[PDB]
Every structure is written in structure tokens, then in C-alpha cells.
Amino acid sequence: SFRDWYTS
Amino acid sequence: PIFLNVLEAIEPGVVCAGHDNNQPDSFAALLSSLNELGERQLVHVVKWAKALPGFRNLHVDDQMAVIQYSLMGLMVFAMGWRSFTNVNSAMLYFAPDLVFNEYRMHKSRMYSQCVRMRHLSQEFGWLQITPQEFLCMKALLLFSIIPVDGLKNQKFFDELRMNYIKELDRIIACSRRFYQLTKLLDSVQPIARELHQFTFDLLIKSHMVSVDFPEMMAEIISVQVPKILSGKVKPIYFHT
Ligand SMILES: C[C@](O)(CS(=O)(=O)c1ccc(F)cc1)C(=O)Nc1ccc(C#N)c(C(F)(F)F)c1
């Protein structure tokens, strides 16, 4: 979710 | 001065907190805006960092980690600077709509840390920090906290840190300026650590005190910040 938002 | 050109060009602008300055300074109100401001600043720190010279050379997972670990410190250091250049250190300029005077410092239940942060702010004027030294130092803070067991591609990190230390010397050029500023950089970490502890404790007991955390900041606080508080993830101090 930080991950999803960062790499989106 | 190519490296500094870039630092100046990517530097975030003004971030407001969205705080209602007609409600009275209550713990829950002040901290709910601080938590919101924290998310709003994370957004800008991400865009900033992705545009930094060499940052994308890092493994993607290490990019994400380094931003999450160092976020507190980056925000503290930039806030100290704002407090200096805007209000000459009289109050803590978290944002244009969230300026902490003495009373707010008390109501936030973070007074001792607040007092450390305005000391830091004073240092900016005392040492006569230049805008260009501030920027290079801020960019170093991104590369100043890492897992004791290292990152996924640790060599790319070490290269990068090394090159940002060199840029800081290309800018200083005396031995004594390096000593003052490495020392200023180190003083960020203890403050960030206390903020981290305070933020963690507050999240755990947040339902009780009516404090509101944005989702992403909750995840960060619950997944990344304990790595730091449990000693798996430590600052890279210059001194002691
Ligand atoms: C209490 C808290 O809201 C926690 S948070 O912002 O959610 C946060 C959460 C996780 C972190 F790793 C760092 C910060 C916080 O420290 N907010 C906050 C917001 C803005 C600024 C600024 N400027 C700062 C400070 F660094 F300056 F203290 C702190």
C-alpha cells in the first residue's frame, strides 16, 4: 500500500 | 554547479496542513492535523527523492525503505529551516496554517521535542547555514538511516551516500565547517527518534485519545517505525 502507491 | 541546480529545482514548495485555526488548541485537533500534514509531506518527499541525482540506481525496495526510515528526520530538518527563514526561529513553522507557539507546544504534549526542534532551528542562523548547504545536508539525511543488516543492494547505497558527502565538501570549499555541519546533521537523529517513539505510542492508544491517523501513515507507523525502535534500523551517525 505504501508499495502500491509508490510503484503504481 | 550541476548538482545544486538540481537540488534547487526539485525542492518542494509550501505544504499546508488543512488545520482549522478556529477550533481551540486541543491535543486531538493538533495531532490530527500533524498526522495529516505528515502524509501531505510524505507525498512531496517521494516526488523529491525520485528526482534526486542517482536515487533510481537503488533497488526499488531500498528506495521505499530509505524514504520511510528517514521521513521523520527530513521533515524535522526542513521544518527547522522553515522556522528560521520565515519566523527567525521564534515559533515552529510546521506549515503556514499550523504554526506552533509555546502554548501549542504544550497542548501537543510534545514540548521537550518542540524545544529541541527550535534549538535546531536556531542553529541554522547561529552557524549561518547557507541555502545551498541546507539543501545538500537535507539530501544527505535521506541516506542516513539503514537496517543494521544492510539494504537489498547495499553497494549502490554506499556509492550514493559517498557521492552526496563529496557534494557537501565540493560546496564547503573549512575542515571546521565540516565538523560543524556533520554535528548539526547528527543532532537530527535523536529528535527524530523521540518523535518516532511518541508517534508510535500515540498510534497504539489513538482510539482512546480521539487522534486520527491517515491509513498510509498508520501502515508506516506499524510496519516500519518498530524496526527502528526495536534497533533493527539505525542512523548512520558521523560522531560518537
Ligand atoms: C505525529 C506525526 O503526525 C506522525 S506522522 O507524520 O504520521 C509520521 C509517521 C511516520 C514517520 F515515519 C514520520 C512521521 C508527525 O510527526 N507529524 C509531523 C508532521 C509534520 C512535520 C513537519 N514539518 C513534523 C516534524 F517533523 F516537523 F516534526 C511532524
Closest CA to B3 of B139, B162, B159: B139
3-class DSSP string for chain B: CHHHHHHHHHCCCCCCCCCCCCCCCCHHHHHHHHHHHHHHHHHHHHHHHHCCCCHHHCCHHHHHHHHHHHHHHHHHHHHHHHHHHHHCCCCEEEECCEEECHHHHHHCCCHHHHHHHHHHHHHHHHCCCCHHHHHHHHHHHCCCEEECCCCCCHHHHHHHHHHHHHHHHHHHCCHHHHHHHHHHHHCHHHHHHHHHHHHHHHHHCHHHHCCCCCHHHHHHHHHCHHHHHCCCEEECCCCC
User: Alpha-carbon distance B114 to B30, whole Å?
Assistant: 13
3-state secondary structure of A8: coil
- Region at B18 (left for phi over 0; alpha for psi -120 to 50; beta for the rest): left
Q: Does B95 touch chain A (CB under 8 A)?
A: no
Query: How far does CA B166 lie from the centroid of its chain?
Result: 21
Count of all residues that appear for chain B in the document: 240
Closest CA to B113 of B140, B69, B88, B76: B76
- Breaks in chain B (C to N > 2.5 A) come right after 173
Count of all residues that appear for chain A in the document: 8
Q: Does A8 touch chain B (CB under 8 A)?
A: no
* Nearest chain A residue (CA) to B224: A2
| Resolution value in angstroms | 2.1
Please answer yes or no on whether A3 and B68 come within 8 Å at the CB atom: no
Per the annotation, where are the binding residues of B? 35, 82, 199
Binding site membership of B199 for ligand 1 (Cβ less than 6 Å): yes
Please answer yes or no on whether B219 and A2 come within 8 Å at the CB atom: yes
* Nearest chain A residue (CA) to B42: A2
The angle formed by the CA atoms of residues B119, B8 and B114, to the nearest 5 degrees, is: 20
Q: How many CB atoms lie within 10 A of CB B1?
A: 11
Number of the ligand 1 atom closest to the C-alpha atom of B80: 27
3-state secondary structure of A1: coil
Cell numbers at B88, concatenated: 527567525
* Nearest chain B residue (CA) to A1: B216
- Region at B231 (left for phi over 0; alpha for psi -120 to 50; beta for the rest): left
CB B71 within 8 A of CB B42: yes
Q: How far is B216 from chain A (nearest CA, A)?
A: 6
Look at the block and give the residue holding cell 521523520.
Answer: B72
First to last CA, chain B: 33
User: CB burial class (10 A; 0-12, 13-18, 19+) of residue B20?
Assistant: exposed
Which amino acid, residue B40? R
Please answer yes or no on whether A2 and B220 come within 8 Å at the CB atom: yes
User: Alpha-carbon distance B69 to B71, whole Å?
Assistant: 6
Domains with residue ranges and CATH for chain B: 1-240 (1.10.565.10)
CB B234 within 8 A of CB B145: yes
User: Alpha-carbon distance B184 to B67, whole Å?
Assistant: 20
CB B90 within 8 A of CB B126: no
Q: Does A6 touch chain B (CB under 8 A)?
A: yes
Question: If you measure from the C-alpha of residue B166 to the centroid of ligand 1, how many angstroms do you get, rounded to a whole number?
Answer: 29
Binding site membership of B137 for ligand 1 (Cβ less than 6 Å): no
Look at the block and give the residue holding cell 549561518.
Answer: B128
